[PDB]
Design a protein around this ligand. Structure first.
Ligand code: HEM
Ligand code: HEM
Lengths: 145, 145
């Protein structure tokens, strides 16, 4: 359950999330677009869910893609900000899950963002320890899907 | 159209938006809920759009309402952060407008948030000058609806 998943965010996991976000969250536009373009490159099958965006290969030059990419980073910002209060983290995660459920995004589908996150993290000198930390946060959302 | 509305965001207006946000945005849960509950109190009819939230009379105590309220504040955070780049502000405003258009929320209906905003600002001692600045930000989003 989402409540059990949130409890998996231990002290050190929370710390690693904050430490890496401090760097990653510094460039929301750049890292956000990198996240999306990597998702579409490594998992081309997900492009169908983003028909509204148009030609996704344009990257940064695609206004709709840039809009979604920047907005995506503020969702991550939101999650990180709620790490101190599990009750708040959960209600925000559930809200966030509602819109993805409406788009029929499964927990398995949602989990594909883990690849992109791991790569962007590694490009900034953050290794497996951090990728695993972020995977735990993603799992919280997966539990609500 | 959206670009044209963003043009009213002059140097002075952006300055007041940033200064007032520094305070208002420092308690996203508290002020976010204040905005929502005030909207519902002053315009009871807007509750019709939030049936999914359940018993909104519970306010802060309502997990779903609290979830929407906190998240709402991150949309504003997004906008404030994009003020110095019209291109980015526009793509993020248009993305934001997509979900509200799907909900059949007209520009006039969206404008009802001006009252709550003015009242929340007043509670932190930000007068009409600041309320006017925020009305202009709301006008940019209204231009997309
Ligand atoms: C770290 C993981 C993810 C985060 C934090 C995230 C965040 C967001 C946010 C905040 C929005 C914009 C608000 C909204 O329209 O609901 C959004 C839109 C969307 N997301 Fe996710 N998302 C994630 C992963 C994914 C994945 C992996 C898929 C699909 C395989 C997905 C599919 C969608 C779709 C289709 C939209 C609508 C885009 C549009 O038409 O504007 N998301 N996501
Ligand atoms: C400053 C003004 C406003 C801001 C920044 C704002 C922000 C947001 C955000 C961030 C979301 C979550 C993402 C999404 O589902 O689209 C949202 C959801 C929503 N907003 Fe707005 N909004 C504003 C005003 C309004 C107004 C005035 C109405 C109605 C008259 C409205 C109706 C909705 C509805 C119905 C939802 C869905 C709530 C749910 O069931 O989860 N919004 N809004």
């Amino acid at each position: 359950s989402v409540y059990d998943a949130a409890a998996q965010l231990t002290a050190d996991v929370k710390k690693d999330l904050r430490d890496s976000w401090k760097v990653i969250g510094s460039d929301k536009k750049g890292n956000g677009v990198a996240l999306m373009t990597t998702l579409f490159a490594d998992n081309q099958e997900t492009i169908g869910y983003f028909k509204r965006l148009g030609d996704v290969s344009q990257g940064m030059a695609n206004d709709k893609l840039r809009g979604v990419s920047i907005t995506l980073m503020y969702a991550l910002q939101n999650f990180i900000d709620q790490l101190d209060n599990p009750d708040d983290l959960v209600c925000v995660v559930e809200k966030f899950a509602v819109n993805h459920i409406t788009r029929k995004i499964s927990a398995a589908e949602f989990g594909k963002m883990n690849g992109p996150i791991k790569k962007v993290l590694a490009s900034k000198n953050f290794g497996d320890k951090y990728a695993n930390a972020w995977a735990k946060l993603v799992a919280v959302v997966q539990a609500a899907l």
